[PDB]
């Protein structure tokens, strides 16, 4: 996964 | 609010070399992985690379188009973001954008430098205030899926930037409730449920595949009435 954190 | 600031831009001969800046202030920057994005009238948005955290040893990765030229780097104690380009071609010339959060929910002004897989959207759709319009992101792979973290991101003149959705479905913090993203069949969509005047603006969807992201050519939305 790319950047997931909110 | 939120900042990127960019520096750097300018005129350039073919085999050069330039330096981009970006300093973030009005977020944790060091929680969030960066990139830097350019805009041509001819090739559209390319995304050129991406900068993870000091938790991950700082791994990078970039297009194909950059690879082995440019290098992006970061200096957490200065909320600042960097792009080294060498061996400038022509086809480097654009307004480089620095990016991050959710995964494109903020954008810097542009910095334009001069050197001298696809994804598909709809090339116009026309709409009038209080309907509800649907635009579409596909991928020339197969089906978009959650895999591809589709994001949705609005184009305003001035060349304006704002993220409006990301993770497939996920609001941008203050994005107005009437956007939302969801996957409808085998594409990701954006749906405005009840347009308004001011939405008339170029509309790009970007998907993730696996270690790198594809932009659409976006979709120039007309609300007229």
């Known amino acids: 996964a790319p950047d997931t954190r909110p | 609010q939120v900042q990127l600031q960019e520096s750097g831009g300018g005129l350039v001969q073919p085999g050069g070399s330039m330096k981009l800046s970006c300093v973030a202030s009005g977020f944790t920057f060091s929680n969030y992985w960066m990139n830097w994005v350019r805009q041509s009238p001819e090739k559209g948005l390319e995304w050129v690379a991406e900068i993870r955290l000091k938790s991950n040893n700082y791994a990078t990765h970039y297009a194909e188009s950059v690879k082995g030229r440019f290098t992006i780097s970061r200096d957490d104690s200065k909320s600042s973001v960097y792009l080294q380009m060498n061996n400038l071609r022509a086809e480097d010339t654009g307004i480089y954008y620095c990016?991050?959060?959710?995964?494109?929910?903020?954008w810097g002004q542009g910095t334009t430098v001069t050197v001298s897989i696809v994804v598909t959207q709809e090339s116009a759709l026309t709409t009038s205030p209080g309907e509800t319009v649907t635009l579409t992101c596909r991928s020339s792979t197969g089906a978009v899926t959650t895999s591809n973290y589709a994001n949705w991101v609005q184009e305003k003149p001035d060349h304006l930037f704002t993220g409006l959705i990301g993770?497939?479905?996920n609001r941008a913090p203050g994005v107005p409730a009437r956007f939302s993203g969801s996957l409808i069949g085998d594409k990701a969509a954006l749906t405005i449920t009840g347009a308004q005047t001011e939405d008339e603006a170029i509309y790009f969807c970007?998907?993730?595949?696996?270690?790198?992201?594809?932009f659409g050519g976006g979709t120039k939305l007309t609300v007229l009435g």
């Open positions: 993770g497939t479905n």
């Open positions: 990016t991050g959060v959710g995964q494109f929910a903020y």
């Open positions: 970007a998907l993730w595949y696996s270690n790198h992201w594809v």
